[PDB]
């Protein structure tokens, strides 16, 4: 199964996020290309609950968290399903890469198809900050761009 | 269950399409508000296969047609699942309305969540034209705006 999200906004940040999953129990391969970010930085990158673009990136809602866990690092057992790694940006403000993930799926009751991907203006503290906010959003900050995840082939 | 598609493009046409379905076997209520259309006209309006926005409205693909039927009117037994009525535009080029549909669903194997809605520049002939093209697209013409259908609440 394949899916894709086209990240757009008014802040100079834009990109394309691709998803691929063979079957429900297998990892989903997430690959991305994002331009217009701060250079030489780390930016929060997550799957948000709703594929609702009626209000900028606000209507995407909170991080997709069907299991009601706190915000964490991708390799933490306790994390939101939507918690992806911070994306590293080069000297030109470009983030490009790919990774495999076992909580993110394109198939089944927790499918992210119809949900949203959000790229943040700040670094995600992976739930390790000294605030209650760290356990909710990772203090990743504003949402310069986002895109609804649709089915493709 | 609720879903929504935000229609955008570069042709002056834009809008919001809302979807609501209680359970799989029940009708889905589709409501829409679309601005920037030709005034006093009828414009093709359909669910397209892919929620892929990488290439304008082109990457949406063809009409969502899992049952491999020909293009028809909403009330025809033989129609694509994605075949919605032509939307009528007023003197200001605004299309606003709502209807119920039994082939369009937000739940199950034929769910339109993660797919796309496309508003056309031309009138849909409902599969009644004298061409092979009528049975494919209804000769609805260009795609001034489209939007990926995402989950909301
Ligand atoms: Cu986020
Ligand atoms: Cu169409
Ligand atoms: Zn999170
Ligand atoms: Zn059709």
Swiss-Prot record, chains A, B:
Top-tier EC class: oxidoreductase
Cofactors required: Cu cation; Zn(2+)
Crosslink (Glycyl lysine isopeptide (Lys-Gly) (interchain with G-Cter in SUMO)) position: 18, 69
Disulphide-bonded residues: 57-146
Catalytic activity: 2 superoxide + 2 H(+) = H2O2 + O2
Outcome (variant: residue 122 to K): Does not enable copper chaperone-independent activation
GO cellular component terms listed in the entry, alphabetical order: cytosol; mitochondrial intermembrane space; mitochondrion; nucleus; superoxide dismutase complex
Positions with a binding annotation for Cu cation: 46, 48, 63, 120
Domain of life, per lineage: Eukaryota
UniProt cofactor note: Binds 1 copper ion per subunit. Binds 1 zinc ion per subunit.
Function: Destroys radicals which are normally produced within the cells and which are toxic to biological systems.
Protein name as it appears in the record: Superoxide dismutase [Cu-Zn]
Organism: Saccharomyces cerevisiae (strain ATCC 204508 / S288c)
Organism placement in taxonomy: Eukaryota, Fungi, Dikarya, Ascomycota, Saccharomycotina
Gene: SOD1
């Amino acid at each position: 199964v394949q899916a894709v999200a086209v990240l757009k906004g008014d802040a100079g940040v834009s990109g394309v996020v691709k998803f691929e999953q063979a079957s429900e129990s297998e990892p989903t391969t997430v690959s991305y290309e994002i331009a217009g970010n701060s250079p030489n930085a780390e930016r929060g990158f997550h799957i948000h609950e709703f594929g609702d673009a009626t209000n900028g990136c606000v209507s995407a809602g909170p991080h997709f968290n069907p299991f009601k866990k706190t915000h964490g690092a991708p390799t933490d057992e306790v994390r939101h399903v939507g918690d992806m790694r911070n994306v590293k940006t080069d000297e030109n403000g470009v983030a490009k890469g790919s990774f495999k993930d076992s909580l993110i799926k394109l198939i089944g009751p927790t499918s992210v198809v119809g949900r949203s991907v959000v790229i943040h203006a700040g670094q995600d503290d992976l739930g390790k900050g000294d605030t209650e906010e760290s356990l909710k959003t990772g203090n990743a900050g504003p949402r310069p761009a986002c895109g609804v995840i649709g089915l493709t082939n």
